[PDB]
Amino acid sequence: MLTLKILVYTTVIFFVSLFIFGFLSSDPSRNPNR
Amino acid sequence: MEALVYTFLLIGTLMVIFFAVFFRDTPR
Amino acid sequence: MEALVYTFLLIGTLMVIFFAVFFRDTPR
Amino acid sequence: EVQFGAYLAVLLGTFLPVLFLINLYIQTESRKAGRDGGIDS
Amino acid sequence: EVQFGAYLAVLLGTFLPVLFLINLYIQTESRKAGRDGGIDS
Amino acid sequence: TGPNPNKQAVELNRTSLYWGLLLIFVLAVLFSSYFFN
Amino acid sequence: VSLWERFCAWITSTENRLYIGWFGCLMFPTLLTATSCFIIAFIAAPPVDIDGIREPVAGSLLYGNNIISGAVIPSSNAIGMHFYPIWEAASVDEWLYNGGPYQLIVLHFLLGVASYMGREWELSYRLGMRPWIFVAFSAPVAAASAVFLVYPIGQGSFSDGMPLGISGTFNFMLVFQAEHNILMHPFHMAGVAGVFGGSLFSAMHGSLVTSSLIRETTENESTNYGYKFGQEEETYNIVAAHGYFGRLIFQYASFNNSRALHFFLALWPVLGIWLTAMGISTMAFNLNGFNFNQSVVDSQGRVINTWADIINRADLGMEVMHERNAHNFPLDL
Amino acid sequence: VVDYENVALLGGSQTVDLNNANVRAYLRMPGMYPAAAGKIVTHGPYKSVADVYNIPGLTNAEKEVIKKYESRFTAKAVAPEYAIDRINNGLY
Amino acid sequence: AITKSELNQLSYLQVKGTGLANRCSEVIGEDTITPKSGARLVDMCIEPKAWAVEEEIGKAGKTEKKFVNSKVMTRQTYTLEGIEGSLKTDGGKIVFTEEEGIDYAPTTVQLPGGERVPFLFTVKELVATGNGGAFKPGFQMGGDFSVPSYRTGLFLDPKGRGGVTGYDMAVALPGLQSGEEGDAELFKENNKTFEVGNGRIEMEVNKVNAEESEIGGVFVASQSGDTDMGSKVPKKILTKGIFYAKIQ
Amino acid sequence: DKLAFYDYIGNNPAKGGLFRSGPMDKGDGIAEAWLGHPIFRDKDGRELTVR
Amino acid sequence: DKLAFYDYIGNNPAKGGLFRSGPMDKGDGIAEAWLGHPIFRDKDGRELTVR
Ligand code: CLA
Ligand SMILES: C=Cc1c(C)c2cc3nc(c4c5[nH]c(cc6nc(cc1[nH]2)C(C)=C6CC)c(C)c5C(=O)[C@@H]4C(=O)OC)[C@@H](CCC(=O)OC/C=C(\C)CCC[C@H](C)CCC[C@H](C)CCCC(C)C)[C@@H]3C
Ligand SMILES: CCCCCCCCCCCCCCCC(=O)OC[C@H](CO[C@@H]1O[C@H](CS(=O)(=O)O)[C@@H](O)[C@H](O)[C@H]1O)OC(=O)CCCCCCCCCCCCCCC
Ligand SMILES: CC1=C(/C=C/C(C)=C/C=C/C(C)=C/C=C/C=C(C)/C=C/C=C(C)/C=C/C2=C(C)CCCC2(C)C)C(C)(C)CCC1
Ligand code: OEX
Ligand SMILES: [Cl-]
Ligand SMILES: [Fe+2]
Numbered sequence: 001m002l003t004l005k006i007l008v009y010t011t012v013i014f015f016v017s018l019f020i021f022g023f024l025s026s027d028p029s030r031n032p033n034r
Numbered sequence: 035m036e037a038l039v040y041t042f043l044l045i046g047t048l049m050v051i052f053f054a055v056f057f058r059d060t061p062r
Numbered sequence: 063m064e065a066l067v068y069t070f071l072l073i074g075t076l077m078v079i080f081f082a083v084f085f086r087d088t089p090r
Numbered sequence: 091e092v093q094f095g096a097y098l099a100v101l102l103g104t105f106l107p108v109l110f111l112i113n114l115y116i117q118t119e120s121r122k123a124g125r126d127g128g129i130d131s
Numbered sequence: 132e133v134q135f136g137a138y139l140a141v142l143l144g145t146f147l148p149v150l151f152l153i154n155l156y157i158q159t160e161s162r163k164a165g166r167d168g169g170i171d172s
Numbered sequence: 173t174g175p176n177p178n179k180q181a182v183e184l185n186r187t188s189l190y191w192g193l194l195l196i197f198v199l200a201v202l203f204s205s206y207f208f209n
Numbered sequence: 210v211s212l213w214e215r216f217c218a219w220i221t222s223t224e225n226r227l228y229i230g231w232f233g234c235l236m237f238p239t240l241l242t243a244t245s246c247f248i249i250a251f252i253a254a255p256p257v258d259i260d261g262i263r264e265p266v267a268g269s270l271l272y273g274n275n276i277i278s279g280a281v282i283p284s285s286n287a288i289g290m291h292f293y294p295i296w297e298a299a300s301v302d303e304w305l306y307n308g309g310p311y312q313l314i315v316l317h318f319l320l321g322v323a324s325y326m327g328r329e330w331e332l333s334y335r336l337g338m339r340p341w342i343f344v345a346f347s348a349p350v351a352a353a354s355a356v357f358l359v360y361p362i363g364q365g366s367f368s369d370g371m372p373l374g375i376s377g378t379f380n381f382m383l384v385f386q387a388e389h390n391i392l393m394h395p396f397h398m399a400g401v402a403g404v405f406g407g408s409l410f411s412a413m414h415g416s417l418v419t420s421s422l423i424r425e426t427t428e429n430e431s432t433n434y435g436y437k438f439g440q441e442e443e444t445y446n447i448v449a450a451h452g453y454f455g456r457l458i459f460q461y462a463s464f465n466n467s468r469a470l471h472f473f474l475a476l477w478p479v480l481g482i483w484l485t486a487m488g489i490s491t492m493a494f495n496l497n498g499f500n501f502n503q504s505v506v507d508s509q510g511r512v513i514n515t516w517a518d519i520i521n522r523a524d525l526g527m528e529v530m531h532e533r534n535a536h537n538f539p540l541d542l
Numbered sequence: 543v544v545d546y547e548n549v550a551l552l553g554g555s556q557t558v559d560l561n562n563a564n565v566r567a568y569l570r571m572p573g574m575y576p577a578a579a580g581k582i583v584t585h586g587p588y589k590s591v592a593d594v595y596n597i598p599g600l601t602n603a604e605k606e607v608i609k610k611y612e613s614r615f616t617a618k619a620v621a622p623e624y625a626i627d628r629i630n631n632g633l634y
Numbered sequence: 635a636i637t638k639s640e641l642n643q644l645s646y647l648q649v650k651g652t653g654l655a656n657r658c659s660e661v662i663g664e665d666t667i668t669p670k671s672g673a674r675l676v677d678m679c680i681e682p683k684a685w686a687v688e689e690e691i692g693k694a695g696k697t698e699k700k701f702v703n704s705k706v707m708t709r710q711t712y713t714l715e716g717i718e719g720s721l722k723t724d725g726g727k728i729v730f731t732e733e734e735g736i737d738y739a740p741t742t743v744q745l746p747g748g749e750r751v752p753f754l755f756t757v758k759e760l761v762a763t764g765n766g767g768a769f770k771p772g773f774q775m776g777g778d779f780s781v782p783s784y785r786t787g788l789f790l791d792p793k794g795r796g797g798v799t800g801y802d803m804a805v806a807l808p809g810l811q812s813g814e815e816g817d818a819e820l821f822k823e824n825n826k827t828f829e830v831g832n833g834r835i836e837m838e839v840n841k842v843n844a845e846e847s848e849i850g851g852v853f854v855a856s857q858s859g860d861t862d863m864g865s866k867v868p869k870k871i872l873t874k875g876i877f878y879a880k881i882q
Numbered sequence: 883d884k885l886a887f888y889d890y891i892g893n894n895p896a897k898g899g900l901f902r903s904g905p906m907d908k909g910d911g912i913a914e915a916w917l918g919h920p921i922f923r924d925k926d927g928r929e930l931t932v933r
Numbered sequence: 934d935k936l937a938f939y940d941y942i943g944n945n946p947a948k949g950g951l952f953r954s955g956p957m958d959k960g961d962g963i964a965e966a967w968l969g970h971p972i973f974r975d976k977d978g979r980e981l982t983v984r
Contacts, residue, residue, distance in 0.1 A: 001295070004295060004296050005296040011238075015238060019231055022217065022234065023231055025213075030335065032335075032336075040204065043197065043201045047194070047197045047198065050197055053190075054190040059185065064133055067138070068276055071145070090438060096209070100200060100203075100207060101139065102146070104197070105143070106146070109150045109154070111184070111192045112154070113150070113153070113157060114182065115189045118182070118183045118185070120159075120162040120165070121161040121165035121181065123162065123165070124164070124166040134903070170180070171179055209954075263740060299709075302705060302744055306744075534788075534789060543797065543826065544821075544824060623783075623787035623797045624787065627786070696935075809892075812911075
């Protein structure tokens with residue numbers, strides 16, 4: 001059951017990091033008035 | 035209870051024959 | 063044996079939804 | 091007395107192909123009517 | 132347990148109107164294709 | 173992607189409709205007794 | 210151009226069939242796993258001991274349930290509010306015996322709906338719109354969160370959450386009325402007024418707008434075919450509809466400004482649902498509705514009954530019969 | 543069970559069964575509830591009413607208070623579904 | 635941890651959730667005790683470690699009565715604790731005569747196939763006779779005990795029928811209350827019964843600590859399962875494990 | 883017997899259900915014979931009536 | 934018992950019918966036990982066999 005925990009933790013951290021670093025990539029400038 | 039099914043099938047066949055004979059595409 | 067009927071109905075509804083979303087008439 | 095699945099087998103196997111054939115004929119007639127410019131398109 | 136006639140009721144009352152509506156749509160599309168001159172009549 | 177030049181139309185006249193209906197009904201009449209057993 | 214820049218350009222692109230965005234990175238996986246688990250559990254799950262008294266209850270189709278009676282049973286009462294992931298069980302069978310799937314489904318689903326709200330705002334921002342649709346969507350999210358998470362937190366156990374089934378909601382409502390005397394809480398009255406008024410206003414708006422259509426088809430064509438995608442026509446020939454509404458009722462009551470009308474349409478049901486969700490959340494901490502039992506007495510001192518006493522009798526009947534084998538002591542604290 | 547013959551001896555009459563009745567059945571005999579009834583309902587089966595006087599640890603006072611009401615007692619066969627709940631049977 | 639002296643050195647906040655509370659302690663030594671008169675075994679603990687249910691299986695073209703292993707569906711709530719009794723000597727042998735304590739615990743196990751088998755693990759009303767006059771490595775004792783009903787008389791089935799309370803008929807089917815015979819075909823399910831079972835246990839001592847007056851060893855037990863208020867045929871269960879006790 | 887048959891609650895039209903389909907014979911069966919009128923008496927001989 | 938079960942005519946694949954639907958358990962049921970091997974003898978002890 002430990003291997004399942006490892007895989008789930010990997011997936012969760014991958015997606016959460018995607019979210020976090022996506023919002024840091026100068027998001028406010030991505031508007032049609034650039 | 036299956037007599038209903040048999041009767042329905044026979045009556046449907048007769049209806050099909052009637053429609054084929056009297057409501058037909060003209061040979062012309 | 064009715065579980066088959068229930069499952070078939072639910073999966074059919076999901077198929078209808080899929081076709082409605084992805085094969086749709088263009089609004090233009 | 092008899093098998094119960096036979097009701098479903100007979101009724102479905104009679105009703106589905108009949109409606110398929112009627113569908114084919116009706117769509118043929120509609121296409122023919124549409125080709126000739128008339129009151130019904 | 133359950134009633135046997137429910138099988139026939141559910142299956143027939145579901146299948147027949149579906150084919151009816153499909154026939155309506157297909158004949159409409161066929162008439163539309165026939166009206167506009169093209170490869171498919 | 174584009175308009176496929178390989179599409180065609182399907183036809184069915186009334187005589188063939190009658191033949192198909194008769195075939196289906198007669199086949200059902202023949203096999204119903206054996207299906208019911 | 211770096212690889213990360215190309216990925217960011219694809220994610221926030223407006224050319225996709227369905228917008229992804231960065232809230233989508235959380236919305237899609239959670240909703241998909243919740244959907245898969247819910248379907249599998251609703252079809253083929255074994256019975257679950259919900260009350261902690263070793264009396265399992267069947268809820269799947271394969272175990273003798275129909276669509277109306279089937280459900281996904283909440284977790285066991287012995288667990289309480291404890292976290293129960295799959296890897297914390299000795300076996301998958303034990304996980305299924307103690308109502309494991311309920312926690313997984315509800316948690317991934319709540320995360321999904323929050324991400325759905327965020328995604329709505331994000332697309333509104335990318336398209337150049339005004340950013341207040343997700344504020345309107347926040348009310349159903351508030352209600353669902355209220356029930357599913359807030360009620361167990363206040364009552365101290367996940368087993369008191371609403372079951373994921375059709376008759377489970379009926380059981381939830383009946384027990385809730387028995388124990389908390391809803392229907393006398395003013396917030397529930399606000400919610401009922403909200404839904405009734407929303408339906409009334411929707412019907413009125415539809416009738417008024419549809420009646421005032423201008424004639425462009427004649428007879429052999431559905432009236433819906435007269436409108437073209439991109440046509441310029443304000444959504445009501447005024448003289449007709451304005452005079453109709455001014456004559457039907459007191460004339461000084463007539464919305465002649467479209468902005469105010471649509472703002473009121475948006476405002477009414479959303480506020481009602483907010484109030485009823487807050488009512489549920491507050492009753493989760495045992496602040497119940499009005500109590501008027503035995504409030505009218507004669508000169509001597511005998512009690513004269515009212516309708517509230519009949520409601521109380523119904524509540525007592527519901528109370529003494531729920532969870533028959535679970536209680537050992539006189540008070541249901 | 544559907545049919546139980548000695549249902550009238552559980553506290554609904556003037557006679558109390560010593561082997562199956564709950565402690566609340568003794569509340570209608572003055573001077574007996576909290577001291578002697580607790581000792582009676584927590585000891586083994588009695589083959590006769592006279593066997594209640596052999597309980598190890600009975601003080602005198604309990605002996606004469608039981609002697610006063612001896613005429614209201616009886617001892618029937620032990621039913622395991624009733625004898626297990628003699629201190630708390632869920633009635634309040 | 636392993637011994638009682640190490641367990642007493644921890645705090646409750648330090649043990650919560652670890653799973654150590656359901657374990658049984660360990661003894662270190664090989665001495666002899668010899669109980670005086672008026673001795674009492676106090677603080678007995680019994681912990682099972684394997685479960686099996688009797689069934690019929692196929693080995694090769696044949697069927698036999700074999701005990702198949704089962705998995706515990708519940709969690710760490712199956713250890714008996716606090717058992718006390720009074721020791722005595724008859725003819726040079728020790729007799730236990732269990733009296734009180736936490737001597738019962740419900741348990742559910744699942745068989746290969748999906749069936750769930752609940753039972754009441756207990757040692758209530760146990761009289762065990764030994765083969766010697768002193769507690770030493772190699773001492774053995776065992777005896778019969780009584781198994782009560784899984785559900786008492788206050789339980790109500792999903793239709794509201796119970797033993798000493800509830801309905802006595804199937805109120806959902808009023809059409810079965812006609813004729814000279816009414817619902818006589820549902821009498822088995824309308825008439826709830828509560829009958830006692832039986833069991834057997836055998837224990838052997840391995841370690842003895844004289845300065846602490848403690849013993850420990852292994853056991854093998856067997857008993858009958860739940861009967862669902864007399865509506866089903868009970869099964870048979872076999873268990874194995876360890877035990878600990880104090881002669882103080 | 884015909885007069886007594888009308889005094890049975892199974893013949894009440896307001897006692898059925900919406901989705902219980904079939905004839906009335908599908909619920910109770912086919913009536914065959916009358917059993918008689920029962921009279922309940924207590925230990926003192928007075929007559930009792932079941933509500 | 935497994936070896937004896939193979940020597941029963943109900944397990945012959947050439948013994949069925951075209952329109953007899955269902956599993957083989959639908960014809961005879963589910964087997965439980967083997968009764969044994971019968972031996973027939975006449976008045977002189979000579980063994981007989983059924984064709
Ligand atoms: C005529 C009488 C009447 C009326 C009109 C109402 C009206 C209401 N009652 Mg009510 N009630 C009544 C009698 C009545 N009650 C009685 C007699 C009792 C006692 C038995 C109760 C007991 C009761 C309880 C116990 C509760 C209510 C609640 C409610 C409210 C429902 C909240 C809701 O649906 O929106 C909320 C909207 C949602 C929950 C939807 C969320 C949608 C999520 C976010 C997304 C879902 C997407 C989906 C999964 C996937 C879509 C499929 C996809 C293919 C498209 C509503 C105001 C509830 C309430 O106040 O809510 C907080 C509540 O908890 N009532
Ligand atoms: C019970 C009533 C009710 C339901 C079911 C409902 C449903 C919905 N409303 C939506 C939107 C809205 N509703 C709104 C206002 C309101 N909505 C109301 C009442 C409801 N609205 C009311 C009263 C109001 C007025 C305040 C607004 C303003 C919006 C939106 O903007 C939004 C929308 O986009 O609508 C067009 C949609 C959001 C889709 C989504 O989450 O992604 C889809 C999610 C999917 C496909 C996956 C979920 C599947 C999950 C995992 C299933 C398992 C978990 C469930 C809880 C199972 C429980 C089932 C039992 C309870 C039977 C959805 C169709
Ligand atoms: C005693 C204090 C205790 C707290 C009380 C709080 C009261 C707050 C009142 C002010 C709040 C904002 C008022 C509306 C602003 C706005 O959105 O304009 C929108 C328009 C204003 O009119 C439009 O106004 C326009 C002029 S102007 O721009 O608004 O200046 C005009 O052009 C147009 O014709 C006209 O339709 O208002 C409406 O049409 C929407 C109706 C709902 C808005 C609230 C109206 C008053 C409610 C009273 C309180 C009800 C309590 C309910 C309890 C559940
Ligand atoms: C990559 C990516 C993406 C995508 C994503 C996705 C698409 C995902 C999916 C996901 C998924 C798709 C998931 C799923 C999962 C599932 C699960 C997790 C399930 C589970 C289940 C279970 C657990 C079950 C169980 C059971 C029961 C209940 C009963 C019977 C028995 C059994 C055991 C079977 C995106 C776009 C965002 C972008 C970024 C990147
Ligand atoms: O879980 Mn649902 O309902 Ca809240 O009170 Mn106690 O617990 Mn149970 O009883 Mn009453
Ligand atoms: Cl309690
Ligand atoms: Fe509009």
